[PDB]
Ligand binder design. Sequence first.
Ligand SMILES: *[C@@H]1O[C@H](CO[C@@H]2O[C@@H](C)[C@@H](O)[C@@H](O)[C@@H]2O)[C@@H](O[C@@H]2O[C@H](CO)[C@@H](O[C@@H]3O[C@H](CO[C@H]4O[C@H](CO)[C@@H](O)[C@H](O)[C@@H]4O)[C@@H](O)[C@H](O[C@H]4O[C@H](CO)[C@@H](O)[C@H](O)[C@@H]4O)[C@@H]3O)[C@H](O)[C@H]2NC(C)=O)[C@H](O)[C@H]1NC(C)=O
Ligand SMILES: *[C@@H]1O[C@H](CO)[C@@H](O[C@@H]2O[C@H](CO)[C@@H](O[C@@H]3O[C@H](CO)[C@@H](O)[C@H](O[C@H]4O[C@H](CO)[C@@H](O)[C@H](O)[C@@H]4O[C@H]4O[C@H](CO)[C@@H](O)[C@H](O)[C@@H]4O)[C@@H]3O)[C@H](O)[C@H]2NC(C)=O)[C@H](O)[C@H]1NC(C)=O
Ligand SMILES: CCCCCCCCCCCCCC[C@@H](O)[C@@H](O)[C@H](CO[C@H]1O[C@H](CO)[C@H](O)[C@H](O)[C@H]1O)NC(=O)CCCCCCC
Ligand SMILES: CCCCCCCCCCCCCCCC(=O)O
Ligand SMILES: *[C@@H]1O[C@H](CO)[C@@H](O)[C@H](O)[C@H]1NC(C)=O
Lengths: 99, 268
Amino acid sequence: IQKTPQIQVYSRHPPENGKPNILNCYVTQFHPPHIEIQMLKNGKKIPKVEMSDMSFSKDWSFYILAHTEFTPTETDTYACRVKHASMAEPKTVYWDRDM
Amino acid sequence: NYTFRCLQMSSFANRSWSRTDSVVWLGDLQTHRWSNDSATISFTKPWSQGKLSNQQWEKLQHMFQVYRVSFTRDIQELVKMMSPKEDYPIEIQLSAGCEMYPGNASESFLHVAFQGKYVVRFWGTSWQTVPGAPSWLDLPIKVLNADQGTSATVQMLLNDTCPLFVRGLLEAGKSDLEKQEKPVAWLSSHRQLVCHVSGFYPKPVWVMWMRGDQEQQGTHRGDFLPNADETWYLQATLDVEAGEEAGLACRVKHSSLGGQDIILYWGS
Ligand SMILES: *[C@@H]1O[C@H](CO[C@@H]2O[C@@H](C)[C@@H](O)[C@@H](O)[C@@H]2O)[C@@H](O[C@@H]2O[C@H](CO)[C@@H](O[C@@H]3O[C@H](CO[C@H]4O[C@H](CO)[C@@H](O)[C@H](O)[C@@H]4O)[C@@H](O)[C@H](O[C@H]4O[C@H](CO)[C@@H](O)[C@H](O)[C@@H]4O)[C@@H]3O)[C@H](O)[C@H]2NC(C)=O)[C@H](O)[C@H]1NC(C)=O
Ligand SMILES: *[C@@H]1O[C@H](CO)[C@@H](O[C@@H]2O[C@H](CO)[C@@H](O[C@@H]3O[C@H](CO)[C@@H](O)[C@H](O[C@H]4O[C@H](CO)[C@@H](O)[C@H](O)[C@@H]4O[C@H]4O[C@H](CO)[C@@H](O)[C@H](O)[C@@H]4O)[C@@H]3O)[C@H](O)[C@H]2NC(C)=O)[C@H](O)[C@H]1NC(C)=O
Ligand SMILES: CCCCCCCCCCCCCC[C@@H](O)[C@@H](O)[C@H](CO[C@H]1O[C@H](CO)[C@H](O)[C@H](O)[C@H]1O)NC(=O)CCCCCCC
Ligand SMILES: CCCCCCCCCCCCCCCC(=O)O
Ligand SMILES: *[C@@H]1O[C@H](CO)[C@@H](O)[C@H](O)[C@H]1NC(C)=O
């Protein structure tokens, strides 16, 4: 049966404005494994995003971790957008600027 | 305890397209990947070959090489024979490996899921369907059990090759497996104070909101989320009556810190 992806977005180091950092988008609990993940800066696709190999958990659902260098500032927003067969439209989750 | 898990994910889109990819973990550290696109199994650590010689690794890899092609043909032939009762697409996953414990004791496992659901395991000397699995699997599993050679190979792989190989991985990877990485923490927010803790390894950790010496009971631990550099991230949140955040602190205890806990005071 299809399972819908869950998306969490969080920072590797304390987010401090102007300070280079790493933003993660962890995508979990989905099936089937085919999925398209983009990270967004001001609503536009960030080009160099790196992805972990897909893997799966004890319950058999898949997960993957995306990450990108970023420098937060108070003029930029960040998000993670996912397309999967389980959803009619892509799902976007914005970074809450704190995680 | 360390659990070594070989995770295979095979997708059959139709009669002309399939792919099989694998990843291998020892505990929470990845040790191999094996892309469909690749003839050979890739190393993700300098110690991924464990204590096996190049010759012995080649032999083990050869067996998997034969298995990967054999498995793909077996599934495609099964779908042909069942046609059109079993439609493409088909997703098969396999989780196989062993759990290593004190002394030199270990338990092995080999579980298979079909369309996301556990359906078959190897146990003892045979493949079996699990109760609840679709009845059309009974016949192909009976036929696979008549393959004595495959049964003997799997019993060797589970009962012998696995724990032996992993003993070698534990010795060769000792300094990575026993690594200590220190957490850093930060705070954010009638409301919810959040203590974020990131960068620690290994996974066990204690994070609690405190008022002085007293643990705040209402502290809720989040999920452990992985960072991309083999460390962990966790938040713990506490709902607090507005105006009464003064005097609160987040405390973090972790093996990497010694007994020097991190204490982060709110509002300060
Ligand atoms: C590898 O280890 C296997 C056991 O380990 C488990 O499975 C593997 C895959 C790993 O996942 C591991 O971590 C697991 O814990 C071991 O399997 C054992 O194989 C022997 C035969 O070689 C089986 O013995 C036969 O047992 C049946 C009775 O079985 C039923 O009852 C018992 C409890 O009483 C249950 O445990 C079983 O689940 C069954 O419900 C006997 O009827 C049969 O006796 C007949 O045959 C013998 C000759 O073997 C004659 O001497 C007798 O007189 C009878 O004719 C056997 O005794 C054993 O069931 C099986 N364990 C399990 C759980 O199935 C495997 O052999 C190892 N292989 C190698 C190469 O090391
Ligand atoms: C996962 O890995 C497995 C195992 O490696 C992959 O399965 C193998 O896939 C290869 C590549 O497709 C396949 O080789 C093909 O077999 C075809 C029929 O069996 C051949 O006819 C075909 O040759 C054509 O493509 C070649 C380039 O790939 C050309 O060099 C050759 O000239 C042929 O090109 C003509 O025909 C094509 C149509 O295929 C046409 O469009 C071209 O224009 C030209 O007319 C390939 O040799 C292996 O047999 C498979 N190996 C097995 C089964 O063991 C598998 O595909 C991977 N999965 C994914 C999704 O990537
Ligand atoms: C939609 C169905 C759901 C699928 C659930 C079924 C579970 C699938 C498990 C099938 C796994 C074995 C597939 C290959 C096997 O059938 C056989 O073709 C090959 C080839 O067999 C032939 O060669 C061997 C030696 O190479 C023996 O001589 C054997 O007797 C012979 O038939 N055997 C091996 O590669 C043995 C090692 C298997 C490891 C499996 C790990 C999961
Ligand atoms: C496939 C599980 C076998 C259990 C233990 C075997 C001992 C070492 C295996 C190491 C690398 C395995 C590579 C993945 C194979 C696959 O899933 O197709
Ligand atoms: C089977 O599915 C693949 C992957 O979705 C698709 O691209 C293609 O149409 C199919 N392959 C063939 C040879 O028809």
